[model samples]
Target: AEQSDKDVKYYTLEEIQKHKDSKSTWVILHHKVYDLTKFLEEWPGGEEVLREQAGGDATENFEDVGFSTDARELSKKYIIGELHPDDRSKIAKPSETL
Candidate 1:
């Protein structure tokens, strides 16, 4: 969490890059980070997607695959950090709010 907001932690691009190891994951979606190491390893289906997504943005992929009602819940458990203001892609609305 950010020093000012417990539920809104901020992280740099470099920090996110450190978790790139495929077996130990951290991926970005809509500017928020999510660690999926356990889910990627133990779950079936596309581990490759998670691996490829680690350390970078995957908003489009996630939307395209269309996570389920259950899979959407999975996202909450993994959300780790939010991108720093300077690093966020949002130009106006913090569009990542979704």
Candidate 2:
């Protein structure tokens, strides 16, 4: 495998929040961010379903749908960056005890 770019910028959850809607959509999955703007129609489930998940964590929904290996490749093309560790609130919270 080639070396991953260390210079690749990471985004905060608030930054990812801006790219919502059909015209420009971005979603978080497993701490990585992806822009799904160009894939509105290509999704088999329908554009609306994909649009619904924009600007938020889509991990649960995506896993719930049982996407396979093929979809991983699809996601890579749209991957912009990883979420900074500080912004990874999806993993835990200050209020959570465990």
Candidate 3:
């Protein structure tokens, strides 16, 4: 089932990074929660870039990716809730949301 709005939460870049480093199992964005620990390396620009983005607001970075406005809007849907359990299981601990 989709998560309710009340169940979703937003975090600042700093907060997200901290969660990543701690091997957090989940993160929230736009009312959706995603598990990123396992897919860290799979990020489009790879983990390093992802980490850098987390250090500050990445609105510009997202723009650089050329995400269409509609696509960008839709991204929020999967950003937090679409992760695979296998991926989460492999993280030694969150190492930053990147």
Candidate 4:
């Protein structure tokens, strides 16, 4: 598979925090920023669970929920950008399986 540039935009955690609103929510997972504004519309009930992590890293929360394979792939669809290089260290990473 060709690893071509995704033309990803990078954003700081601070910048993400500003978007924590019903009109323009965003969430972080695996250091990638996802725009959830549209997803919220199609979401089922219990949306407050998603709002709880708005503009914040949901890596652990998402993992805890044990999302299905399709759910994971769907998340990649909302991936609008990546974390800033300087802010990457602030988020937790999955433990090495090795």
Clashes of each: 2, 0, 13, 0
What TM-score, computed on C-alpha atoms, does each candidate reach? Answer: 0.53, 0.54, 0.35, 0.59
Candidate 3 residue spans exceeding 4 A from truth:
1-6, 10-13, 17-45, 65-74, 79-98
RMSD of 4: 7.3
What value does the lDDT take at residue 45 in candidate 1? 56
What is candidate 2's lDDT per residue for 21-93, written digit by digit as tens?
5655556666777655654545564545655545455455443332465455666676777776667674333
* lDDT against the true structure, each candidate: 0.53, 0.55, 0.38, 0.55
- Model 4 per-residue lDDT tens digits across residues 1-98: 33322587676766655543555556676567776665565543334556545555545543333244444665668788887766656433312100
lDDT of 3 by residue, 6-73 (tens): 35444333344453342443343322344444334333434443444342222333433323454344
Model 1 lDDT per residue over 54-98, tens place: 545545434333254445556557777676655545322222212
Off by over 4 Å in 1: 1-8, 18-20, 45-47, 58-60, 63-69, 90-98
lDDT, residue 76, model 2:
66
Residue range with the least summed lDDT across 10 consecutive positions in model 1: 89-98
